[PDB]
């Protein structure tokens, strides 16, 4: 039973030519969102066909979207679809279609134009957000080093995602989701002061009724731990003692049989 992600609750509009669309997203006990897509088509084209050959704009799970040079006095329709990591059948949920047309009666809100900021410099490429009287760095791209910090800076200055070709390292704080990973050394690390490095199936804990695998270092008791199997049939190992619930077989029949000659019995 996979619960698809919940579509954005509401849509608002801001205009300047340029048109901005931002959608609020709230979710509970549902699939987490990983990407947001907006599709915009002309209303007449929508009547002719349903969202087919409709230009789409994709964002990295950012609520606000910007359309530059929107058609003037032309009807349009939009939908915002949340994207999750589930199966294709319920991977994506789309919001309710909302029509919209640029009109002389629509108030012009140019505040969003000033509230952001980007700059192209020989030294780097940098994006900023206007916060009161100051500007906060969003992402940086240095010229001397191919370092790309992504995300609003922490109060202590810790960037969420960091890169370093100099050390040939890709540094990401948080989580990484990939279909597969190929490597030569899965060296688990106790990155935090009190972390517990381990490899396991999601939502599995040692000495638990779940049916997963758990392997890692238990910093609480400072001993390695292991568990493979369900609640009843399992291979559970603690540094002090090992327990194997399931039936165990050692060797194979005729393991030490003479190859040149067989065996037999007679009376």
């Amino acid at each position: 039973n996979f619960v698809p992600p919940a579509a954005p609750i509401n849509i608002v509009f801001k205009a300047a030519y340029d048109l901005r669309v931002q959608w609020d997203w709230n979710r509970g006990a549902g699939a987490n969102v990983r990407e947001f897509v907006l599709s915009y088509i002309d209303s007449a084209e929508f009547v002719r066909t349903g969202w087919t050959k409709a230009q789409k704009i994709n964002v990295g799970a950012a609520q606000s979207a910007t359309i530059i040079s929107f058609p003037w006095k032309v009807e349009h329709k939009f939908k915002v679809s949340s994207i999750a990591w589930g199966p294709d059948a319920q991977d994506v949920t789309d919001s309710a279609v909302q029509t919209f047309i640029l009109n002389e009666s629509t108030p012009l809100d140019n505040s969003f134009v000033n509230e952001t900021g980007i700059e192209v410099n020989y030294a780097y490429i940098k994006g900023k957000i206007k916060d009161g009287s100051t500007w906060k760095q969003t992402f940086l791209i240095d010229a001397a080093t191919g370092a790309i910090n992504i995300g609003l800076l922490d109060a202590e200055g810790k960037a969420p995602i960091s890169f370093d070709p100099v050390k040939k390292i890709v540094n990401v704080d948080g989580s990484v989701i990939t279909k597969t990973i190929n490597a030569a050394n899965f060296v688990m690390t106790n990155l935090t002061g009190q972390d517990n490095p381990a490899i396991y199936t999601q939502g599995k804990t040692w000495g638990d009724t779940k049916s997963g695998i758990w392997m890692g270092m238990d910093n609480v008791t400072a001993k390695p731990k292991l568990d493979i199997g369900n609640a009843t049939q399992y291979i559970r190992y603690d540094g002090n003692i090992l327990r194997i619930s399931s039936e165990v077989v050692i060797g194979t029949p005729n393991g030490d049989i003479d190859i040149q000659t067989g065996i037999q019995g007679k009376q």
Binding site: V220, T221, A222
Partner: protein, 69 residues
């Protein structure tokens, strides 16, 4: 035996149990904060009756040490 701990840096802190298990020549445990601690150790032995358990007067190491960070 059960082993308790208390951060001695502050004037008064509540003793906290961190290890429960059989008494051994050497005891290993982790998952403790960074502050300097005082350690008391007590042993509990079960009377033939399941309910009643005989404990010990808490013995405390005179030395006080910081957790190896």
């Amino acid at each position: 035996c059960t082993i308790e701990l208390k951060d001695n840096s502050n004037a008064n802190n509540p003793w906290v149990k961190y290890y429960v298990g059989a008494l051994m020549p050497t005891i290993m445990f982790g998952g403790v904060p960074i502050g300097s601690y005082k350690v008391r150790i007590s042993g509990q032995i079960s009377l033939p009756d399941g309910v009643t358990i005989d404990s010990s007067g808490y013995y405390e190491y005179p030395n006080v040490f910081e957790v190896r960070y």
